[PDB]
């Protein structure tokens, strides 16, 4: 089937695809750099971002649901599988400089996927959308019962 | 047996994992410190003296180089820092040994990768006098905090 989406509150959103669950956050912090981390130029490259390769399909769909153009848009960054921190996919959606237009599109994507989406990005500052697969050390305990319990899943 | 970690937190928007550093560590105990991150150049006595911004209750990030790391952490603790992050600069500076006396706060060595990932979330350029990379920055502002966990 198609993944199901629910937002806990303005901070934490969640996707459920197959057996896997991915945390989605929007904030002004980046822990990835072009110089050190993996750039996703084409959908195949997503098979470098997740602990198991197959689950990357869930990311693929989500990308296209946001409006990401795999042809013209900036590559998203992700942490390599070999690294032991976890899995972290960044979309640079800053309301500034060269990502402004792109960012808008992604936020519009969110508005269609999460009814009641809250835009935390402040104008002129840096802003990011981050995806962490649940269970990896990078999602911490944000995929536990105290969070996913009081979120109800749909679609 | 939980790995040592450096993470960044915003104002309650979440915790983001920067690095699991395999580098050398000193434990006073298995500790978890959280606070503002602040640059102190080489961590010498004069470096801390010349800072224009508060060090107390803050984690200091310093470069390896002019003095021994024990002196760096002794100075940081002398100015009431709660933890020390040490990263290695691109130019290696020889250590010289002056008069020194006889580790309570956590001390974690991080890759220059993690240092730059922290800096990109920090503000204010480092003085040109330091002769260090342009990625260097001084203060973690915007109510952000760094969380160092040493097990
Ligand atoms: C996610 O996306 C955002 C937005 O695109 C990025 O943030 C910008 O990153 C770019 C590229 O590094 C920065 O562009 C540079 O801007 C400088 C002006 O400084 C302004 O912004 C800084 C913020 O640090 C303020 O401190 C300062 O007061 C200014 O307001 C310029 O000096 C640079 O010029 C360079 O390019 C010209 C050609 O255009 C060269 O000829 C010059 O010699 C010079 O080298 C450059 O344009 C920009 O500052 C960033 N903006 C903000 C708001 O941070 C993020 O970096 C990106 N994140 C990731 C992880 O990729
Ligand atoms: C979001 O929910 C978590 C717990 O699920 C809570 O601790 C946090 O304060 C909430 N934040 C906002 C902005 O609603
Ligand atoms: C991931 O890391 C391994 C070894 O560290 C490297 O060979 C591989 O090319 C990396 N992946 C990418 C997409 O660069
Ligand atoms: C540093 O000391 C001053 C004393 O005036 C105090 O107000 C401040 O809160 C201290 N900083 C921290 C981070 O504890």
Residue numbers in the entry:
A (entry chain B): 87 to 241
B (entry chain A): 195 to 209, 211 to 297, 330 to 378
Lines from the paper:
To verify the binding mode of sAD to GP1, we crystallized and solved the structure of GP1MACV in complex with sAD to 2.7 Å resolution. Crystals belonged to a tetragonal space group (P4322) with four copies of sAD/GP1MACV in the asymmetric unit. The designed sAD forms a complex with GP1MACV in a similar fashion to hTfR128, while maintaining the overall structure of the hTfR1-apical domain. Most of the important interactions that GP1MACV makes with hTfR1 are also formed with sAD, including the key interaction with Tyr211. We did observe some structural differences; however, the long loop that connects parallel strands βII-6 and βII-7 of sAD, which was mutated and shortened, changed its conformation compared with hTfR1. In the case of hTfR128, Glu294 from this loop forms a salt bridge with Lys169 of GP1MACV, and in the case of sAD an alternative salt bridge with Lys169 is formed with Glu340 from αII-2 instead. In the crystal structure of sAD/GP1MACV, we observed electron density for N-acetylglucosamine only at the Asn251 glycosylation site of sAD and not near Asn204. In the sAD/GP1MACV structure, Asn204 of sAD is in close proximity to GP1MACV, suggesting that an N-acetylglucosamine attached to this residue will sterically prevent the formation of a complex. We thus introduced an S206A mutation to the sAD portion of Arenacept (referred to as Arenacept-M1) to eliminate the N-X-T/S glycosylation motif.
All these viruses utilize TfR1 as their cell entry receptor, and the ability to utilize human-TfR1 (hTfR1) distinguishes them from non-pathogenic viral species. As a potential broadly reactive immunotherapy against NW pathogenic mammarenaviruses, we designed a TfR1 mimetic that blocks the GP1 receptor-binding sites. Thus, we based our apical-domain design on wwTfR1 instead of on hTfR1 to achieve high-affinity targeting of pathogenic arenaviruses. We introduced several modifications to the wwTfR1-apical domain to allow it to be produced as a stand-alone protein. These modifications included the elimination of a long loop (residues 301–326) from the apical domain and the mutation of several hydrophobic residues at the interface between the apical- and protease-like domains to increase hydrophilicity.
